[PDB]
Design a binder for this molecule. Structure first.
Ligand SMILES: OC[C@@H]1O[C@@H](OC[C@@H]2O[C@@H](OC[C@@H]3O[C@@H](OC[C@@H]4O[C@@H](OC[C@@H]5O[C@@H](OC[C@@H]6O[C@@H](O)[C@H](O)[C@H]6O)[C@H](O)[C@H]5O)[C@H](O)[C@H]4O)[C@H](O)[C@H]3O)[C@H](O)[C@H]2O)[C@H](O)[C@H]1O
Ligand SMILES: [Ca+2]
Length: 415
């Protein structure tokens, strides 16, 4: 008799996996029916924004940790503390503390207090390499613990860039990194960030930021260890990685099902190359599962969120379907140690979570518009038409004005 709407996003392999686990939920709870609204990752934010603007909020939905404070102030998210505490067996202490705490808010700051959502996952973004390619080229394998320096990374990438089938044309490249998701590590490992320590001042004009951004663009334009602009336009580098054309490409746990289906070469995980700090860096992603403050069935809505986030049966089904690593720390640890589950160095994912992964800058700000502005006009830098130095000087005041406005919202909306 009960009906819940569950809104979320995913790549095709993720949509299938969560639809399957929702069906499992419905088998376990024959009185609850779940109506699914699913979208591509790229369409999700617009669709969810529209639902919230209309105050037509799905019972259960994915949301961005950077929106937690805004969602609490606007009464979007139900406080689920008591339903979680009263639930049968569920103990959120087996779950990554880093994950759980992103969705706690005590009235003033994130990380403590009442629960306003549950972690979908933690998403450490690792660096993968094509071991088949390395071994066919006679190049010594990357070390699983010691990061390449930037110079060493470029060196090995040049060695991997070649005409393998002998038709006179390059057909294999060292890498082909997407700035949207892989610039952060180079920036962070070079001792820079988009914003300052206090999270109130834009710092993209830092010489260390500029160096990292120029190095990134230079992979394509100067060192030439990527497909050309035209070649990437013909077929994007994610697809070229899948077809075995690239030495290096990032790997998230959400990728594993798709990679199981499409990747026919051997690959493994390594630390990201390290800039001036000598320490590798990358991001640890997360999404929240929240419950509408306006839901007519809070108990069943939280049961669904718990099933996806924390229930050993729901969790086991998601991990088996290769779209995430276990939310339970002990289970993740035994998972990482199981050699029959590839890649071999799965442990790298845990090392990112525990040691050298960071949050996206927008997780600290009231909205992310200031950061979206940086990326909106970035492509001329990436294609070598504008220097990194010239762009960040132009972008910084635009970003700062947006950040200042986000801060003023934090103040006004929280009266
Ligand atoms: O190179 C130029 C570009 O290439 C062409 O576009 C090709 C792109 O490739 C395809 O995308 C491949 C995927 O992209 C990377 O994954 C990035 C995103 O992760 C997935 O979501 C997982 C989810 O996110 C994690 O949380 C991250 C953040 O943390 C919070 O702060 C915030 O809420 C989150 O956003 C969670 O832990 C986890 O559950 C998304 O699906 C994906 O977008 C990986 O390399 C691949 O999976 C795709 O076809 C194109 O985008 C174009 O020409 C040019 O743009
Ligand atoms: Ca060739």
């Amino acid at each position: 008799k009960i009906e819940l709407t569950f809104m979320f996003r995913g790549q095709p392999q993720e949509q299938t996996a969560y639809k399957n686990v929702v069906k499992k939920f419905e088998e376990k709870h024959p009185n609850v029916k779940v109506n699914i609204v699913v979208t591509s990752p790229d369409q999700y934010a617009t669709k969810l924004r529209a639902a919230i603007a209309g105050r037509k909020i799905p019972d259960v939905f994915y949301f961005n940790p950077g929106e937690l404070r805004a969602y609490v102030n606007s009464n979007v998210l139900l406080d689920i503390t008591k339903y979680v505490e009263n639930s049968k067996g569920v103990n959120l202490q087996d779950i990554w503390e880093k994950g759980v705490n992103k969705y706690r808010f005590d009235g003033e700051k994130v990380g403590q207090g009442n629960l306003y959502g549950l972690p979908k996952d933690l998403g450490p973004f690792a660096l993968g390499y094509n071991k088949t390619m390395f071994e066919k080229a006679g190049i010594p394998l990357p070390d699983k613990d010691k990061p390449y320096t930037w110079q060493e990374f470029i060196d090995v990438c040049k060695k991997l860039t070649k005409d393998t089938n002998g038709d006179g044309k390059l057909d294999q490249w060292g890498t082909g990194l997407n700035a949207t998701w892989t610039l952060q590590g180079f920036v962070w490992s070079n001792g820079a960030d988009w914003i300052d320590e206090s999270k109130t001042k834009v710092t993209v004009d830092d010489p260390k930021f500029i160096e990292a951004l120029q190095f990134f663009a230079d992979m394509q334009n100067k060192y030439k260890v990527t497909p050309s602009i035209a070649e990437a336009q013909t077929l994007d580098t994610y697809q070229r990685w899948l077809r075995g054309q690239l030495g290096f490409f990032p790997v998230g746990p959400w990728d594993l099902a798709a990679f199981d289906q499409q990747i026919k070469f051997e690959y493994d995980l390594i630390p990201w190359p390290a800039g001036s700090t000598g320490k590798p860096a990358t991001w640890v992603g997360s999404l929240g599962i929240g419950v509408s403050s306006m839901t007519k069935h809070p108990k069943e809505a939280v049961e669904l969120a718990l099933y996806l986030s924390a229930d050993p049966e729901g969790q086991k089904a998601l991990v088996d379907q290769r779209v995430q690593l276990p939310n339970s720390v002990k289970v993740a640890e035994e998972w990482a140690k199981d050699p029959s589950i590839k890649p071999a160095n799965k442990q790298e994912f845990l090392d990112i979570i525990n040691d050298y992964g960071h949050s996206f800058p927008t997780e600290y700000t009231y909205n992310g518009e200031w950061y979206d502005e940086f990326y909106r006009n970035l492509q001329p830098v990436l294609d070598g038409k504008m220097s990194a130095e010239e762009y960040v000087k132009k972008a910084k005041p635009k970003m700062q004005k947006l950040l200042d406005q986000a801060i003023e919202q934090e103040k006004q909306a929280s009266k």
